[PDB]
Amino acid sequence: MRLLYLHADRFEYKTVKPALKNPPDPPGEASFGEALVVFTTVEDGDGPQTVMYAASDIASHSSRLKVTTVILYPYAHLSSRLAKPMAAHKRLIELEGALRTKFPGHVHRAPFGWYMSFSIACKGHPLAELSRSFTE
Amino acid sequence: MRLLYLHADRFEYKTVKPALKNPPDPPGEASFGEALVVFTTVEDGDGPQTVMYAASDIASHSSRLKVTTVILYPYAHLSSRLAKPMAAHKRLIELEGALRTKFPGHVHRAPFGWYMSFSIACKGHPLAELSRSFTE
Ligand SMILES: C[C@@H](O)[C@H](N)C(=O)N[C@H]1[C@@H](O)[C@H](n2cnc3c(N)ncnc32)O[C@@H]1CO
Ligand SMILES: C[C@@H](O)[C@H](N)C(=O)N[C@H]1[C@@H](O)[C@H](n2cnc3c(N)ncnc32)O[C@@H]1CO
Ligand SMILES: [Mg+2]
Ligand SMILES: [Mg+2]
Secondary structure, X not given: OEEEEEEEEEEEEEEEEEXXXXXXXXXXXXXXXXXXXXXXXXXXXXXXXXXXXXXXXXXXXXXXXXXXXXXXXXXXXXXXXXXXXXXXXXXXXXXXXXXXXXXXXXXXXXXXXEEEEEEEEEXXXXXXXXXXXXXX | OEEEEEEEEEEEEEEEEEOOOOOOOOOOEEEEOOEEEEEEEOEOOOXXXXXXXXXXXXXXXXXXXXXXXXXXXXXXOOOOOEOOHHHHHHHHHHHHHHHHOOOOOEEEEOOOOEXXXXXXXXXXXXXXXXXXXXXX
8 A cells, every 4th residue: 555645734626537437436526624635545465454554554643743634535646556446445445444443533535436636735844745655 | 767747727836844954956936827747756766768768758748738837846755766865856957958858838847855835736637647657
């Protein structure tokens, strides 16, 4: 699993055209104030241990930033060892579930399988932009 | 070299605190309208062939999108095989130079060695978000 943690002042996205023949999640949009935006690329190795490692780290980092909202934002482009789409979708649902057992704030999982528009205003402070990798 | 190509409706950045002891580029800010924003992570293997491959591809993609502005945006977080900072800086300057010989539009190289704030509104069309890798 490859993640990018962006500490945003604001974030918004809108699904556009479907990127898969059958996106598993309905189309939509949302916007937010201060939030940790987590661009998430599910990799072939990812299983339950990986999800739990990622959930814990996300929770921990959010704690250090005093953020109260985490956006789980599916992203195909952070690595070149992607999981297949149905496995990736399952992992992301598991990650949302796991994160709720470790982080007390709002957890929003963006829809999976779509081309997206978005806007982010990303903070400039030293921890506002970090990358993570998790495996088992 | 690992790149992320974002077709933006708008982009702006501002350097914040220095991320290196001696950033090689002065602090600053800039904003743009429609532009291909190229998040660029220089890797250890990168040399002159890599720069020329990347310059050509960037030019080619920009051509297909009918963009007339390319932003070369230094980014430490797209891979886990980074070049050292002075090598990365040299490569990015070379890449800016190479790109100007292949792409007729505005080429802006963001300052190197800084924590950054930014905002981007990224387009939702199918080619608005792509990743690339170049080597020799
Ligand atoms: C494209 C860009 O604007 C948008 N944000 C996008 O990336 N959409 C992705 C994810 O929602 C999802 N997806 C497919 N495979 C994966 C994977 N392995 N990991 C995470 N997401 C995946 O399927 C879409 C197409 O690759
Ligand atoms: C941090 C985030 O907000 C900001 N955008 C940032 O990434 N700043 C980076 C790049 O400007 C640069 N840098 C250092 N090494 C590299 C490298 N190998 N490749 C590209 N840039 C590098 O040095 C800074 C600190 O890593
Ligand atoms: Mg809509
Ligand atoms: Mg300034």
